[PDB]
Each structure stands twice: as C-alpha cells, then as structure tokens.
Amino acid sequence: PTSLDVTSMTSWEYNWFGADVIYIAKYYEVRKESVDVISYRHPITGEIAT
Amino acid sequence: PNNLDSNVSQIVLKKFLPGFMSDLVLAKTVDRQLLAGEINSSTGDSVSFKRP
Amino acid sequence: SQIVLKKFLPGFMSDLVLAKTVDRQLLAGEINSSTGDSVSFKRPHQFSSLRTPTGDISGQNKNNLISGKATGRVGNYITVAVEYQQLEEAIKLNQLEEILAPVRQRIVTDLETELAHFMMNNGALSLGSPNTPITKWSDVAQTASFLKDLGVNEGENYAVMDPWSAQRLADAQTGLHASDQLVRTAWENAQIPTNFGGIRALMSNGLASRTQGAFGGTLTVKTQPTVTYNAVKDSYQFTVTLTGATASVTGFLKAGDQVKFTNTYWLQQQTKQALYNGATPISFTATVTADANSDSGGDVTVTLSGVPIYDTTNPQYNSVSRQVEAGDAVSVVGTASQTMKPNLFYNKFFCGLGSIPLPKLHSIDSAVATYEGFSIRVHKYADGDANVQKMRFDLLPAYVCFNPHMGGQFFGNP
C-alpha cells in the first residue's frame, strides 16, 4: 500500500485535490569510500593511465 | 597486612543501559488532514464539520 | 544644598596577601560536575628498615603498605543582596555601576577573612608566648629555623605580620651599622626587604582576631587515645578527653587554642630524632578545631588537628617521641580570655583555595565581574510588581588542608 511522508505544512485549498495525493522524497548522501585504482602503463600513445 | 583501598577510586561510566519502548500505530493510521491547522485556543474550544 | 557632585568620595579597603600566597595550583577546575562536591589527593609513603647480620633470611617480617588521603571540599555561598526601588536608584545613577565598586570589595574581603580563620583553625605548629608582641629579629627568624628543622624544603615559606609590628622591625633595621642601602631604605620608606631572616615576610592590615576563652585548673588526660596510622591516616585529626577542669563553664575552649603536651616531643620526620631548641626540647602542640564546653566534674571532650602518631606495629609513620597515655600533663597557651590578632607562618603546600564557576539562571539577566582572578556572578530580577528590583552577587569557594604539620601561629618571645 501507499504511505505518504509527513506534510505538516498545510494548504488552504483542500478538496483532497482529487481523492488523494502521496508525497515521496529523494535522499542524497555523500560518503568517503576506499577504492582501488589500477594503473595501466602501456607505452603506446602515452604511458601513465590510472 | 596491606590496606591500600585508598589508592583507587569508584568510577561510574558515562554509559546508559538500553531501556524499554512502545509502538506508534494509531497516531499514524488516524486521519489528520481535516483537523490540522483549524483549531485556535484564542478563537474557541470547539470546531464543526458538515455531514453529507 | 541641591548641587551634588557626581563623583563619589573615597573610602576604605584592606589588602590581599593570603589568596595570592596560598597554593592555587592543585585545586583548580577539579571540582567539576562529575567529581561531586569533594575530591582527595594522595599521600607519600614511608618505610622502616631492619638490622640483622645474616643474609639467607629471605623469609622474615616485612613492611606494610598503607595509603592515605587528603580530602578537599566546597564551602558556603558568599552572597550579598540589596533590595531597593530601582527608579529611585536610577534617578541619579547611570547603569547602576556605583553599587559595583564597594561590593566586589565585600565579597573579596570576606573570602580572605574565611581563609585566615581556616589557616588559623587548622594550623598546628605554635611558637612564642601570645602576650609578647614582635620586637626583634629572632622573633621572625625562629619560624624559618623551626621550618628548616622539621625538614621541609620543597616549596617556599611565608610570614604575615600586622602593620604596627613592621614599624618596629624597620625601626630596628635603622639601627644597623654597615648596610647603607638598608639604612637608607628603612629611613625613607620604613620598608623591610623581601626575604627577612630566611623567610618571605609580609605586612597586612586585614587579618583575623580571636579570643582565648575562659579556662582554669591543672588539666591532664583521662583516657588513652588511639593515634595509630590506620585510625588517623585520612584526616590527621583525633579526639581526646581531659579531666581536672573547672566545674561548669560554657565556652571552655574556643576554636584556635593551642594545647601543649609536656612530655611528648617533635621528631625530625626523616631521621626520627628529637628536636632541641637551644636549651630545652620542643614539646608537641595541637589546635582546637570546634568549640568545647565543660560539664560537671571537670571533663572536657575535644577534637584536635595534628596527631602524635606512635604506632607500634607500623613504626615508619611515627611523628612523636612517646605515646600519649593516661596521667600525662598538658597545658594551654596564653591567658584566660584575652583577645589578640595572631601572626601567621606557613609553607606553600599547607592549605589550598579554589573557585567553582556558577552557571547562568534561566530567563534572568546576569553578568560576570572579574576582580584579581575571582569571578563574581551578578544576577538581577524584579519579583513582585511593587517596583522592588533585586540584585545579587555570588561566589563559591572550596578549601583543602594538605598537611597540618607545616604551618600554624607564632608570636614574640622574651
């Protein structure tokens, strides 16, 4: 079933704007993660390539 | 014999043991849109809605 | 009669030497929200040896390990409060700042009187006859000599004397024969130098005064007290009962009197040997802590600071030649009920002094006033609608006594 996020902010115009409306949210995070860098060093057309 | 209990101290850690909890279901299930932002302590103590 | 100057007239104030000279290092920021209302410091350990001529004696009677403590705590509030019509006050007083100047003085003056009483009430060592004032150089040199003889080195010793008494030392200094700098300084400013006879001397007008308290009769000890290190390892205080006193006298012994045990002498705390004062050995003394009454039959029970430990199972902690036992002869210094201002001498690590920061009261306007390192919290409120505004000033002190055997009172001797 559908479970809407809280909407304490309220609207003067309210007929349910139809039967109903559901609010969903996008959540953005930033984290510092350890990753392995691989260096391919083929001499052809430039050597260093990480 | 040795009496060296004055060389130490009674230490109470700054840690809190977990407690008990309850469940919130009814407050989520009951309808809150109609009554939200409608009652004022200054305006009065009762509100009314119309029946079909 | 209407033109009134806005500049206040000068007033009176004493000086501060005790708060500056006492140790303000160990007891600082240690009575926090987690330690409680008191905290204890450790005590040094002492050992005693054995004298035997054999070596394969790996199993014998060894020493013992006993740990002591010295506990310091917080005192009562120093509060001054005024009630007044704020409108009538503000008629001619901008920002209510005329009140501020003679208030920080009362809070600062009172803490110093409290420190003096504690130092006088908890100090143990005594020197000279209380009646005689200080007139010569030996009266000051004796304190330094006694402190050196006890065996204290780490730190620095101090002495405080009344202003009239210093006039006398400067007068004596004007009589020197070869030190022209000293003679000129004493003739001009009547100022004695910093180090006087091996101890740093101080002159102060603000100093506490005490009354002797009526007594009479050849006092003596009734019951043998317990002065073992296990008993007195936490406070250096002990209780004793005395007989042969007056029938029924209220206030028999005031706080601060010195009771001297005749047959028990001090010991050099390291080598454990007696002390010789040139012509006679030095006897042991203790200081009355709380007021003691006298009941019918002449029996007085009292508590004294400073213990003559003569433990027989842990000899390494002895501080007296012999054990106080029943029938011993005791006396008290001074006369019946005279009043005097004692002169003090002490080591750095004798008594402490600390302050407890005070948080701001909710929804009540306040401020913090600093005065030579002492922070006073001022609060203002207007409870009641009768135009009665109230202002209060608060400061919270804390005291600790490290070792009673490194300080006390001294007077002049003829």
From TrEMBL, chain A:
Q: Quote the protein name from its UniProt record.
A: Gene 3 protein
Organism (species): Shigella phage Sf6
Automatic annotation (TrEMBL), chain C:
- Note one Pfam family from the annotation: P22_CoatProtein
Q: Which InterPro entries match?
A: Phage_coat_Gp5
Which regions are flagged for Polar residues bias?
Answer: 46-64
Q: Region Disordered: start and end of each range?
A: 35-64
- What is the name of the protein in this document? Gene 5 protein
Q: Which organism is it from?
A: Shigella phage Sf6 (Shigella flexneri bacteriophage VI)
Q: Which gene encodes it?
A: 5
